[PDB]
Design a protein around this motif. Structure first.
Motif, short mmCIF file in Angstrom:
data_model
loop_
_atom_site.label_atom_id
_atom_site.label_comp_id
_atom_site.label_asym_id
_atom_site.label_seq_id
_atom_site.Cartn_x
_atom_site.Cartn_y
_atom_site.Cartn_z
N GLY A 1 85.50 89.85 2.79
CA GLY A 1 85.26 88.43 2.67
C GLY A 1 86.26 87.63 3.46
N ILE A 2 85.83 86.42 3.84
CA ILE A 2 86.67 85.46 4.54
C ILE A 2 86.57 84.13 3.80
N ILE A 3 87.71 83.52 3.52
CA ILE A 3 87.74 82.21 2.86
C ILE A 3 87.44 81.17 3.93
N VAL A 4 86.17 80.78 4.04
CA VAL A 4 85.74 79.85 5.08
C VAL A 4 84.47 79.17 4.59
N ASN A 5 84.27 77.93 5.03
CA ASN A 5 83.03 77.21 4.77
C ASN A 5 82.16 77.32 6.01
N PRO A 6 81.20 78.25 6.06
CA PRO A 6 80.39 78.44 7.28
C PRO A 6 79.43 77.30 7.60
N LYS A 7 79.26 76.36 6.68
CA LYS A 7 78.36 75.23 6.91
C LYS A 7 78.90 74.29 7.99
#
Ligand SMILES: NC(=O)C1=CN([C@@H]2O[C@H](COP(=O)(O)OP(=O)(O)OC[C@H]3O[C@@H](n4cnc5c(N)ncnc54)[C@H](OP(=O)(O)O)[C@@H]3O)[C@@H](O)[C@H]2O)C=CC1
Ligand SMILES: O=C(O)CCC(=O)C(=O)O
Length: 417
Positions: free
Chosen positions: A105-111
């Protein structure tokens, strides 16, 4: 509150209570065997460099290379990744795959990330976690907010780093069909759920031809579950729901028309010829099969006594609470455990990995037949454990998976008892 990992450990401890497992093996299983936390630096479109936090947890690899998806969610934590890897271990163990448990997992907002930024993120994640992944070490897969396009980008980056010295196609699954992809990936979870539902109906001695099914949640999994049920099993689809609301029709529904009306009007609400209903009363129709394929934890003490479904197929990831589990078992309701009912996706992912490793690719019919055999065997093993040990179906699935992992650990000599 309610730590994710701790709940997984508790569940693992509730499972060991129903079987004979040594203390050292349980302590080994309570700890992930390897956790990797890396920084993922990418170049943004404005030219600035932003660093993201990436995870890669390999819970156990006694049975073989670890398997698990990669999540791109703003609320991702190390505890969630560890718990999901632990659950993935039992998921691959119950369906008898030569796999371990893994998760990333990556802590990111892909939006808010563009296509170029998303590609850079995938490539940088591969560059960061290359040393702990491989075709025979750790095989990632699609997950929430991640699609096959990101899988293709990741596979290309891995192939570039490895210099084409091996099966770079097999390092990651869920790839597009043009590059090491597999047929039947889109309907894997629904097909597995349908196979388990058919096996459960056979076990209960009831014929599904002309029966009623209600599916709670109309995503890809729910829509494909309803469509496959209506087509193969011959059942009558009665009620479906989106995140907004639900519809009811005692004469039946056409899943294709509902999907067409959902994307056109943006929701399933106000379907012509159907009565608008809510999820809470949709879970309470008198049906033979109920398939929650939506938001987790929808069946609790409040609504457990009102469930009238003969079979509950937990397509979603744990939509039933343990107390609700006990209440349903007391009522004579057959429950398919959540990590067994939706095990078709990981099975088709294993088939894709086998095709990539072998260099030979199968057709839709062969994949469907192999999935049928695997899911039928896994369900019948779980049901036989259920009958023999006089425990809950979830408990039996936990017993089977942990027994397989424990036997694999004992064979390697990791634990001497
Ligand atoms: N996708 C897979 O391969 C597999 C999925 N699972 C689990 O199964 C479920 C469905 O799969 P997936 O295709 O990823 O889901 P999707 O993202 O494709 O669809 C989500 C759906 O559930 C609905 N939904 C969200 N919250 C609620 C709610 N509170 N009440 C009623 N409906 C709700 C959404 O409504 P709306 O359409 O209005 O947005 C939508 O219909 C997920 O929970 C997933 O974790 C595990 C097995 C493999
Ligand atoms: O294919 C995989 O390894 C993971 C897919 C998945 O998310 C699942 O089957 O629950």
């Amino acid at each position: 509150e309610i730590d994710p990992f701790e709940m997984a450990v508790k569940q693992l401890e509730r499972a060991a209570q129903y079987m004979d497992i040594s203390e050292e093996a349980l302590e080994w299983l309570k700890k992930p065997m390897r956790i990797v936390e890396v920084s993922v630096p990418i170049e943004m479109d404005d030219g600035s460099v932003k660093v993201f936090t990436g995870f890669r947890v390999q819970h156990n690899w006694a049975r073989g290379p670890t398997k698990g998806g990669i999540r791109w969610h703003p609320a991702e934590t190390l505890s969630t990744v560890k718990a999901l890897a632990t659950w993935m271990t039992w998921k691959v163990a119950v369906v008898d795959l030569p796999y371990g448990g893994g998760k990333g997992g990556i802590i990111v907002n892909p939006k808010e990330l563009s296509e170029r930024e998303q590609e850079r993120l995938a490539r940088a994640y591969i560059r960061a976690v290359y040393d702990v992944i491989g075709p025979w070490t750790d095989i990632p897969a699609p997950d929430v907010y991640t699609n096959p396009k990101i899988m293709g980008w990741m596979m290309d980056e891995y192939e570039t780093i490895m210099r084409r010295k091996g099966p770079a196609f097999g390092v990651i699954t869920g790839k597009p069909l043009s590059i090491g992809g597999s047929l039947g990936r889109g309907t894997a979870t629904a097909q597995g759920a349908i196979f388990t539902i058919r096996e459960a109906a056979k076990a209960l001695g009831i014929d599904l031809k002309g029966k009623k099914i209600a599916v709670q949640g109309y995503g890809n999994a729910g829509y494909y579950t309803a469509k496959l049920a209506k087509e193969q099993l011959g059942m009558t689809v009665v009620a479906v729901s989106d995140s907004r609301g639900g519809i009811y029709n005692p004469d039946g529904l056409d899943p294709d028309e509902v999907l067409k009306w959902k994307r056109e009007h943006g929701s399933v609400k106000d379907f012509p010829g159907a009565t608008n209903i809510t999820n809470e009363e949709l879970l309470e129709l008198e049906v033979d099969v109920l398939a929650p394929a939506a938001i987790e934890e929808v069946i609790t003490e409040k609504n457990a006594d009102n469930i009238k479904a003969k079979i509950v197929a937990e397509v979603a990831n744990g939509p039933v609470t343990p107390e609700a589990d006990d209440i349903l078992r007391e009522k004579g309701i057959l429950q398919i455990p959540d990590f067994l009912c939706n095990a078709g996706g990981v099975t088709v992912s294993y088939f894709e990995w086998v095709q990539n490793i072998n260099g030979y690719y199968w057709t839709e019919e062969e994949v469907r037949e192999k999935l049928d055999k695997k899911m039928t065997k896994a369900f019948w093993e779980v049901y036989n454990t259920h009958k023999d040990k006089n425990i809950h179906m979830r408990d039996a699935a936990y017993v089977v998976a942990v027994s397989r992992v424990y036997q694999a650990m004992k064979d390697r000599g990791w634990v001497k008892k």
